[PDB]
Amino acid sequence: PIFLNVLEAIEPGVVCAGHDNNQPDSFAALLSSLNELGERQLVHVVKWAKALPGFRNLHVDDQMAVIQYSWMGLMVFAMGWRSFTNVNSRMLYFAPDLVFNEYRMHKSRMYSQCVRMRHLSQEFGWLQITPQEFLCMKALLLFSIIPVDGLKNQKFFDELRMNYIKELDRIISCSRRFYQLTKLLDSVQPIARELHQFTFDLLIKSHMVSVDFPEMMAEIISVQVPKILSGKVKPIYFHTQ
Amino acid sequence: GAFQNLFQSV
Numbered sequence: 686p687i688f689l690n691v692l693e694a695i696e697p698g699v700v701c702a703g704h705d706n707n708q709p710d711s712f713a714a715l716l717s718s719l720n721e722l723g724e725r726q727l728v729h730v731v732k733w734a735k736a737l738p739g740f741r742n743l744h745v746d747d748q749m750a751v752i753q754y755s756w757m758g759l760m761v762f763a764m765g766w767r768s769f770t771n772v773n774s775r776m777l778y779f780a781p782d783l784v785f786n787e788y789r790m791h792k793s794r795m796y797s798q799c800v801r802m803r804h805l806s807q808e809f810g811w812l813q814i815t816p817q818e819f820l821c822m823k824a825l826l827l828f829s830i831i832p833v834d835g836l837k838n839q840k841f842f843d844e845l846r847m848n849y850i851k852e853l854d855r856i857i858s859c860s861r862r863f864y865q866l867t868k869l870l871d872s873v874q875p876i877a878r879e880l881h882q883f884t885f886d887l888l889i890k891s892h893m894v895s896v897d898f899p900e901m902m903a904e905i906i907s908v909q910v911p912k913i914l915s916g917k918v919k920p921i922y923f924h925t926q
Numbered sequence: 927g928a929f930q931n932l933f934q935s936v
């Protein structure tokens with residue numbers, strides 16, 4: 686099982702946010718720490734993505750684009766998994782040093798979004814998602830958001846996405862299961878969209894609320910995220926929404 | 927250029 690060997694081998698390890706848990710919870714502190722965590726996780730997502738089977742088949746511009754469009758969904762999905770495996774979805778396990786209880790969900794001003802993410806986490810339990818299913822699904826999320834007008838080399842992307850769908854099917858009553866997992870994958874995208882909107886709005890007013898955005902987060906959220914929010918870049922859904 | 931710099935640096 687070469688493909689799964691690779692996915693297990695390249696899977697990122699633990700990433701800490703650097704949050705000072707001694708400071709009282711505040712919107713500014715929680716969100717600044719989430720932003721720094723995003724910056725740290727981005728580095729791991731890039732290293733992981735570049736090591737994926739077939740990823741180098743893509744035009745280099747498209748390689749950069751898919752990472753910049755898909756990181757939110759990738760990271761939410763992995764976080765939901767960590768939450769499921771570590772705290773049985775009782776809390777949102779963003780990092781070992783940044784675990785959200787209900788009070789933090791409220792103080793972050795993202796309670797509705799957190800609810801949805803906790804629901805996703807719970808789905809890993811409700812569906813008895815296996816580690817191997819998780820890894821294949823997560824890889825597929827890298828190839829699940831593209832420009833409406835297409836990538837630089839659309840053909841190489843289409844082929845790559847096709848093969849990752851095939852890898853998922855082979856890891857998979859089979860029709861029921863495939864239906865379930867594709868439905869779960871689709872469910873990530875509306876969550877990512879709500880977070881895209883939230884973080885964009887936050888960046889714009891960040892100076893007024895003392896929220897710090899690191900360099901790559903600020904760049905990506907101002908240059909790439911608006912392409913999604915303006916409708917130039919859209920998720921690929923399995924099922925019609 | 928910050929993302930591209932990261933991407934090209936490994």
Ligand SMILES: C[C@]12CC[C@H]3[C@@H](CCC4=CC(=O)CC[C@@]43C)[C@@H]1CC[C@@H]2O
Pocket residue numbers: 716719720722723726756757760761764779780880883884887
């Ligand atoms: C984008 C964001 C910082 C990065 C966060 C994101 C929520 C989802 C998330 C989960 C992670 O595990 C890594 C950090 C990220 C990717 C936050 C929502 C608002 C904040 O600005």
